[PDB]
A paper describes a structure:
Beta-2 microglobulin (β2m) is a 99-residue protein, physiologically acting as the light chain of the major histocompatibility complex (MHC) class I. β2m displays a classic immunoglobulin fold, and is well conserved among vertebrates. β2m tertiary structure consists of a seven-stranded beta-sandwich; according to standard nomenclature, β-strands are named from A to G, and loops are named after the neighbouring β-strands. The characterization of β2m structure and folding dynamics gained considerable resonance when the protein was found to be responsible for Dialysis Related Amyloidosis (DRA). The mutant protein is the etiological agent of a previously unknown systemic amyloidosis, whereby patients carrying the D76N mutation accumulate large mutant β2m amyloid deposits, especially in internal organs.
In the wt β2m structure, residue D38 resides in an area rich in positively charged residues, and establishes H-bonds with both R45 and R81. Upon D38N mutation, the interaction with R81 is lost, while H-bonding is maintained with R45. To compensate for the lack of the D38 negative charge, the E50 side chain moves toward the mutation site, bringing the E50 carboxylate at H-bonding distance with N38 and, in parallel, pulling along all the CC’D-loop. Contrary to the D53N, D59N and D98N mutants, the structure of the D38N mutant displays evident conformational changes relative to wt β2m and the other D-to-N variants. RMSD values calculated between D38N and both wt β2m and D76N are over 3 Å, when 97 Cα atoms are taken in account. The values drop to about 1.2 Å when the β2m AB-loop, which is found in the closed conformation in D38N, is excluded from the calculation. The β2m region surrounding the D38N mutation site undergoes significant conformational changes, leading to rearrangements in both the CC’D-loop and the C-terminal tail. Moreover, in D38N variant both D and E strands are longer due to torsion of Psi angle of S57 and the formation of a H-bond between the O atom of this residue and the N of S61. The analysis of D38N Bz-score distribution shows a pattern similar to the D76N variant: the EF-loop (hosting N76 in the pathologic mutant), is more rigid than in all other variants, while the CC’D-loop (as in D76N) and the C-terminal tail show higher flexibility. Although this mutant is the most destabilised (ΔTm of—3.4°C), the Tm drop is much lower than in the case of the D76N variant (ΔTm of—10.4°C) and, importantly, D38N does not display increased aggregation propensity.
Numbering used by the authors: 0 to 99
Write the structure that this text describes.
C-alpha cells in the first residue's frame, strides 16, 4: 500500500483583474490513493459555479487532478482551495494569492 500527500497549487488562468471574468484553477498533484475531495471556496463557501475536473495517473502510484471553475476576482473576496485526503489529519486549505 502506498499513500502520498497531495501537492496543492491555486492559480488563475489569466492575470487577475478586478473585476473581470477569469478561471480559478486548483492543481492537486502526486496523491495516492485516488480518494479525495477538492473544492474551491469563496470567502469560505463552496464556489457557486460549475466545477470542471480532469483526473490522470502515473504508473508510480500517483494521481493528478486539474480542477477549475469560472470566477470574477475582486478586491474584497478571498478564494481558497480545500482538499481532504486520507494523508491529511484535517482538511487542507490553500489560499489563492494573486501575487504568489
Amino acid at each position: 500500500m502506498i499513500q502520498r500527500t497531495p501537492k496543492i497549487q491555486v492559480y488563475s488562468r489569466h492575470p487577475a483583474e478586478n473585476g473581470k471574468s477569469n478561471f480559478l484553477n486548483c492543481y492537486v498533484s502526486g496523491f495516492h490513493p485516488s480518494d479525495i475531495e477538492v473544492n474551491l471556496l469563496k470567502n469560505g463557501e463552496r464556489i457557486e459555479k460549475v466545477e470542471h475536473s480532469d483526473l490522470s495517473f502515473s504508473k508510480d502510484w500517483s494521481f493528478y487532478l486539474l480542477y477549475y471553475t469560472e470566477f470574477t476576482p475582486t478586491e474584497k473576496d478571498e478564494y481558497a482551495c480545500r482538499v481532504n485526503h486520507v494523508t491529511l489529519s484535517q482538511p487542507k486549505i490553500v489560499k489563492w494569492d494573486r501575487d504568489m
